[PDB]
């Protein structure tokens, strides 16, 4: 047969790449030597093409002009601080230790100094729960209890642009416009609507999958399609 | 639209041109590689054994 669509993806051709050359900045926490003596002023609020959410331009004391992962409620003129002793206000970055327990946080680091990994999409946030001398617990947006190094920095507040998922796209054209700003081939043709040579669920006089959809984890690429290692399916029970 | 005669009309793109090295009109001005002598790709001249009968 022929290599299936998911196998074409990996090659990384034009159709499958993201429009990087059209993207703005890589939102990462500024690397402060120490002392926390770093502060700056919000200069402008911009739109971010890679996340369909607002972001903010800031001018730091030492002349550094950079774009920042904007939480909800940040306006032009506001003064923001980054460091070990940053004032506990929305929009400020500081290690999980300095952050008081029970406060919503975003752009959380996995390993201290990576610039942030978790909780950075529209309207989400992580919940700081437990503290310790060795490990600080954090409840990620998926509901998982993630243990982290208290040295891992984060920003107080929830990400901006919340509620984007509330309104429907209504028409195909609207999806089209968004899809064009991400690394994805759209629209989507059903495997079942294809020929046998093109996909494992292809072929047949009528449309239906051949074998059952739940495939094994050990399945080879080209064969791994449908419900991947499903612990269960349906809604019943 | 037919793939025959009616599709031959848009053909005004220049590709293969006279070659600076071998003198044949095979230097792809877009690829910058001569399909005859291998100029642009190889320092050695393009040559293969299948260019003649095996025992010749």
């Amino acid at each position: 047969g022929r290599r299936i669509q998911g196998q074409r993806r990996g090659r990384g051709t034009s159709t499958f790449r993201a429009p990087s050359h059209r993207y703005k900045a890589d939102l990462e926490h500024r690397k402060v030597e120490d002392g926390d003596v770093i502060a700056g002023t919000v200069v402008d609020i911009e739109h971010d093409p890679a996340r369909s959410a607002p972001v903010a331009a800031v001018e730091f004391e030492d002349g550094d002009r950079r774009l920042i992962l904007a939480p909800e409620g940040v306006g032009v003129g506001d003064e923001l601080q980054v460091g070990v002793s940053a004032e506990i206000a929305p929009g400020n970055t500081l290690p999980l230790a300095e952050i008081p327990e029970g406060v919503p946080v975003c752009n959380v680091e996995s390993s201290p100094g990576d610039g942030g990994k978790f909780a950075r999409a529209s309207g989400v946030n992580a919940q700081l729960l437990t503290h310790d001398r060795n490990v600080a617990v954090v409840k990620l947006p998926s509901g998982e209890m993630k243990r982290l190094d208290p040295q891992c920095r984060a920003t107080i507040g929830v990400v901006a642009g919340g509620g984007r998922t509330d309104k429907p796209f209504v028409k195909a054209g609207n999806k089209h416009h968004k899809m064009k700003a991400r690394g994805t081939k759209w629209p989507n043709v059903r495997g079942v609507a294809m020929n046998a040579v093109d996909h494992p669920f292809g072929g047949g006089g009528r449309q239906h999958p051949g074998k059952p959809k739940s495939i094994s984890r050990n399945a080879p690429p080209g064969r791994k399609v449908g419900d991947i290692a499903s612990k269960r399916t349906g809604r019943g029970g | 639209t037919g793939a025959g005669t009616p599709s031959q009309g848009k053909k005004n793109t220049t590709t293969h041109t006279k070659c600076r090295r071998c003198g044949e009109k095979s230097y792809h001005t877009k690829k910058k590689v001569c399909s005859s002598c291998g100029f642009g790709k190889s320092a050695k001249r393009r040559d293969y054994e299948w260019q003649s009968k095996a025992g010749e």
């Binding site: 609020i45 739109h47 909800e72 306006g75 929830v158 642009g161 509620g163 509330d166 309104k167 | -």
Partner: protein, 73 residues
């Protein structure tokens, strides 16, 4: 509201576009001053025509339930 859609898309879709857009176009109070003059500039961007305060908020609302929580703690 959603009258531009004509007889297309069905009740649910054009009903929610109206409710969302209706609240989006309302008069919102400026966090800076306090005048009801805030307008949307684009996705998640808000600005008071009075004092010129430009800020971040929800996509279709200047303030979201989750954002109002931040202050509590």
């Amino acid at each position: 509201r959603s009258g531009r859609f004509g007889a297309r898309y069905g009740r649910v879709s054009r009903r929610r576009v109206a409710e969302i857009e209706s609240e989006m176009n309302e008069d919102h109070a400026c966090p800076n001053c306090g005048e009801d003059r805030v307008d949307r500039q684009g996705t998640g961007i808000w600005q008071c025509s009075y004092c010129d305060y430009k800020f971040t908020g929800g996509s279709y609302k200047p303030e979201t339930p989750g954002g109002k929580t931040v202050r509590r703690s």
